[PDB]
From Swiss-Prot, chain D:
Disulfide-linked complex of alpha and beta chains of 3 possible sorts: a 570 kDa complex of 7 alpha chains and 1 beta chain, a 530 kDa homoheptamer of alpha chains or a 500 kDa complex of 6 alpha chains and 1 beta chain. The central body of the alpha chain homomer supports tentacles, each with the binding site for C4b at the end. Controls the classical pathway of complement activation. It binds as a cofactor to C3b/C4b inactivator (C3bINA), which then hydrolyzes the complement fragment C4b. It also accelerates the degradation of the C4bC2a complex (C3 convertase) by dissociating the complement fragment C2a. Alpha chain binds C4b. It also interacts with anticoagulant protein S and with serum amyloid P component. The chain holds residues 541 to 595 of 597 of the full protein. It comes from Homo sapiens (Human). Chylomicrons in the plasma. This is C4b-binding protein alpha chain. It is found in: Secreted.
From Swiss-Prot, chain G:
It is found in: Secreted. Disulfide-linked complex of alpha and beta chains of 3 possible sorts: a 570 kDa complex of 7 alpha chains and 1 beta chain, a 530 kDa homoheptamer of alpha chains or a 500 kDa complex of 6 alpha chains and 1 beta chain. The central body of the alpha chain homomer supports tentacles, each with the binding site for C4b at the end. This is C4b-binding protein alpha chain. The lineage of its organism: Eukaryota, Metazoa, Chordata, Craniata, Vertebrata. The chain holds residues 543 to 595 of 597 of the full protein. Controls the classical pathway of complement activation. It binds as a cofactor to C3b/C4b inactivator (C3bINA), which then hydrolyzes the complement fragment C4b. It also accelerates the degradation of the C4bC2a complex (C3 convertase) by dissociating the complement fragment C2a. Alpha chain binds C4b. It also interacts with anticoagulant protein S and with serum amyloid P component. It comes from the Eukaryota.
């Protein structure tokens, strides 16, 4: 049908792996990894504030 | 009733596939893929700046 | 002997929405799906308007 | 007893009594919240298809 | 150990009620209530504005 | 036998040892996080019931 | 597809530990810890506002 193009695209992605359920987890994990890296950067780039701002 | 238009729209989307439960997953997967891509861009466009910063 | 206590208007509203369908659990999914669809569309726009912007 | 620092918890607990089944309370709220968020998204969508017509 | 301070704090909160699982729900519900109120304000302040 | 790129994972794993049952660790954090988020929300709410007041009175 | 590269990357991460399900939890926990720290800072840097006036 029409309107379902988004769904089909997602469905196609679910075939990147044998268990489509594994696809979602893989992405969730990768996404976590990326978000964490940004968080680590913010944390460091703020301690680099306080450390210098102890100065 | 009336006020249920949003619900109906969602319900219609759930018919893009035989198993409506698959529809939600398909969308979640696609959404993950998009979000990840943006995260990758931000990551690259930041590693591209730490570099510039020291030249 | 039930009387709904005070400060529950939000709850009632949600409850009313749960009657848009025979099965209330189906209501939440329907909305979640629609919401996903909308968010995705926005994401697609941002993606296109970024492959385009800077393109010239 | 009930320790101090649990005021937030008690408030939530009180809300869970708006209905016979407390698990229904959380769902009711989640649904209403979804409805509100969707409405906002619909507005943004329209007010963007309109930027793209009105000029 | 150390670094576990956050965990301990959360653990302490889980003792606000006999069933710790009820604590998380209570908070989730309260949070929902607050978020909704904000959403309602934004909605009204847009139908107005 | 851990590869490289797994540093984030190891860190999380170490946190999971703050308590005997590891599943309890995640809940404890989720609860604490909720508490903090809520406090911020309450502040925003108060600082808006206050601000509109300053603007409109 | 530029689709499967993302998946592969995630899949590789799932091998940081013997049980891949543990990987996701470890990350979720770490992420929580980071978010909480930020929240604590915001809270303090706002109570430090409700001091000066
Ligand atoms: Cl409230
Ligand atoms: Cl993609």
């Amino acid at each position: 049908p029409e309107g379902c193009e988004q769904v089909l695209t997602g469905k196609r992605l679910m075939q990147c792996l044998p268990n489509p359920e594994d696809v979602k987890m893989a992405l969730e994990v990768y996404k976590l990894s990326l978000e964490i890296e940004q968080l680590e950067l913010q944390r460091d780039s703020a301690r680099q504030s306080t450390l210098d701002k102890e100065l």
